[PDB]
Symmetry: D2
C-alpha cells in the first residue's frame, strides 16, 4: 500500500550541484529498497498484531523504523529540491527564520553545523515545534523520521548518509552542504510551513 513516488524532475536536473548518477541511485535503488522492505514489514506486523504476538511486534520495530523512516525521509527530500530552487525564502517563512535564528545566514550556519556534525548516517532537519510555535533544528540518526521520533513537523531535510554525496564530494561533507543550498525548493518548504 506504499509506493515509490516519481521524481518531480529529471535525474540530471540538479546538475552540477548534485550529479545525475547520485540522483538515479538514490531514488531508483535506495528509496525503492526502503519502500519494498516497508511493505513486507507492515504485512508481517499485521499478522503479528492479528494474533496478539507481542514478541513478534517488538522484534519488527527496528525494521519498521528503518524502512518506514527511509520512505518518509526520502519522499520529503525529493520535494525539498528543485532545479529552480536556491536563493532565499520570502514572506512569513523568512520572518519566522529571522525571528528564531537571527538571520537567514545564521540559520544556514546552524543547519549546516547540525548536518555536518552527525556521526555516522543521519539527517539534518529544519522543523516546526507546534507546542512552542517556533522553528527548530534537529538531527536524526539513520532513518529515524523527524515527526515520529521528536514530534517536530518536518519542513526541510538534508540527507547526510554517505550515499547522498560520496560519489561526487567524497569525504568532504562540507562541500556537499554548501552546494545543496543552490537547489533548495523554498516554495515547498513554505508550503509545509503554512500547513502548520
Amino acid at each position: 500500500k506504499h509506493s515509490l513516488p516519481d521524481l518531480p524532475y529529471d535525474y540530471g536536473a540538479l546538475e552540477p550541484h548534485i550529479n545525475a548518477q547520485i540522483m538515479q541511485l538514490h531514488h531508483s535503488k535506495h528509496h525503492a529498497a526502503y519502500v519494498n522492505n516497508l511493505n513486507v514489514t507492515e504485512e508481517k506486523y499485521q499478522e503479528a498484531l492479528a494474533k496478539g504476538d507481542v514478541t513478534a511486534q517488538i522484534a519488527l520495530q527496528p525494521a519498521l523504523k528503518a524502512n518506514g523512516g527511509g520512505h518518509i525521509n526520502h519522499s520529503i527530500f525529493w520535494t525539498n529540491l528543485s532545479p529552480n530552487g536556491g536563493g532565499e525564502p520570502k514572506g512569513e517563512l523568512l520572518e519566522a527564520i529571522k525571528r528564531d535564528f537571527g538571520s537567514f545566514d545564521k540559520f544556514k550556519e546552524k543547519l549546516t553545523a547540525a548536518s555536518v556534525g552527525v556521526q555516522g548516517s543521519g539527517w539534518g532537519w529544519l522543523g516546526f515545534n507546534k507546542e512552542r510555535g517556533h522553528l527548530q533544528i534537529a538531527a536524526c540518526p539513520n532513518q529515524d523520521p523527524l515527526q515520529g521520533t521528536t514530534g517536530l513537523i518536518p519542513l526541510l531535510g538534508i540527507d547526510v548518509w554517505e550515499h547522498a554525496y560520496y560519489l561526487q564530494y567524497k569525504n568532504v561533507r562540507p562541500d556537499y552542504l554548501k552546494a545543496i543550498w543552490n537547489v533548495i525548493n523554498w516554495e515547498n518548504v513554505t508550503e509545509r510551513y503554512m500547513a502548520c
Copy 2:
C-alpha cells in the same frame, strides 16, 4: 485481547523472602497497568496500520515496547517463582548449567552480577540461544523483553526495578537477590528449557 493472569499462589506465599505487600502491589497495580496500557496501545496501532500511517506506527513504538514488554516480563516472572521453589535444578538443566557456566554456584554468581549491575530499571535473564544451542545470561533495560529484543528464549527472569524490592530491602539490591534464590521455581525453568 490481553488479560492479567491470576497468580498461581497467594500474595503472602513467598514470605519471608518477598513480602505480601510487594507481591500485591507488583501484581495488582504494576502488572495490571501494563496490561491495560498494552490493550489501549494495540488498538491505536491497529488503526494506524489500517490507514497506512507510518508516522503514527513509529510514534507508538515506545509505548508498545514498554507495556508489551511489561506484560510479557511479569507474566513469566510469576511462573518463575513458587512457595515450593528454591534449592537447585536437576536433570538436563543442571547439566546444561554445569556445561555452560562451570557449576551451579558460578551460574548464580554470574546472574546475580548481571542483575545487580543494571543501572536504572531492568531485568536479569537466564536465556537459551537457539542458534548456538547453549545457555546465556543477559540484562535488559526497563521493560524491553528478552526474546523480542535479543532473540534469546527466556528461561528465568529477575526483576530489578526498584518497585520489586524497595519496600523490603530498600537500596540493598544484593540482599534482594540473595533471598530470591529461595523461591525460584526450577520446575518451571526446566519446562521452559525442555520446550526449546
Copy 3:
C-alpha cells in the same frame, strides 16, 4: 576530590510531603554510593588516560556517566528543595515562565507530564537553553545529567527513580509529583536562572 554535600536542612524538614525515611536513605545511601563510585571511576580514568588506553577509557564511560550524573543530579536536587519552599516564583523567572509556557499552571502541567511519562528511571527538568534564550522542559533517563547530555542549564529537577517516592507513595507517581510542588525552593531556582 568529590564529596557528599551536607543537606541544607534536617531529614524530616520536608514532612509531610516527603518523609524523613526517604530523605535519609536518598541522601546517606543513594547519593553517598554515587560519590564514592565516582571517585573510584575517575581514578581509573586518570590511569587509562595516562597510558593512552582508549579501550579502557571507552569501557569506563557508562560508570562515569551513571555515577558522575548521579552526583550532579542529586546535588542540585537537594538545593531545589526547602522546608520554606512551595508557592510560586516571582520576578523575572515568573515572567520567563509565563512567556515560554503561557502560565505557571501550564508550566506545572508540562513538567509534571514529562516527569510522569518517564519509562523506567529518570529525571524531569526545567532547563535554560542559552542558544535560544528561553526555558525548556526535558526528561533524562537514569542518571544522565541535563547539561552534560543536552547542553541545557539545569534550573529545577525532579527525581522520578522509584526510590525517590516508593516508600511513601508506592506506584502512584502522580501523588508524589503533586506533593513535591509544596517544597520547591523557588529562591534557588531563581538564583540558577539569574546566573545564566
Copy 4:
C-alpha cells in the same frame, strides 16, 4: 600521543577486490581525521578531569567514542587485509571456527549476514569471548569499538560504512562482502586468536 599507522602495503595492493582510490581515501582522509580528532578530544578530557569537571567529561563522551573507536577499528582493519590474503585459515583457528560455527562456509555466511544487516554505518566482527572461551559474531554501530563496548576481543573486522565500498560497489553491499574474502589476512587473524 596517537598517530596514523602506515599501511603495511601499497594503496593499490588489494586490487581488484578493493580499488586504490578507496584505500587512499579511507586511510589518508578518514582514518587520519579520526586520529587528529582523537588527540584533540583526549587533551580536552585531561583538562576536564584535572579540574573535576564531570559535566565536561560526560559531554565529551560521544566524540571520544567516535574518534577513539574510529582509530581503533581502522587500525585493526588494515592489519586484517593483505594482498597475499584470501583462502581459508588453518590450524587451531580453523578448528575453533568449525567447532563454533559448524564449518568455514557457515561462518562466512554468518559474518556476511551480520555485516549486510547493519542499518546505517557500522562494523561486522568475528570476536573472542574470553569468559565463555569461544568465537562470537557481533555487529557494532558507527565507530563503537568491539572490546570497549562488548568486552569481546576483536579478531577480524569488516567495515560497512558506505565510504568503505560505495565508489566501487555503489549500493550493492553484498558484492563488497563477497570480494573482501579474497583479501582477508588469516595470518593476522590467527595471531590475534593465539594471543587470547
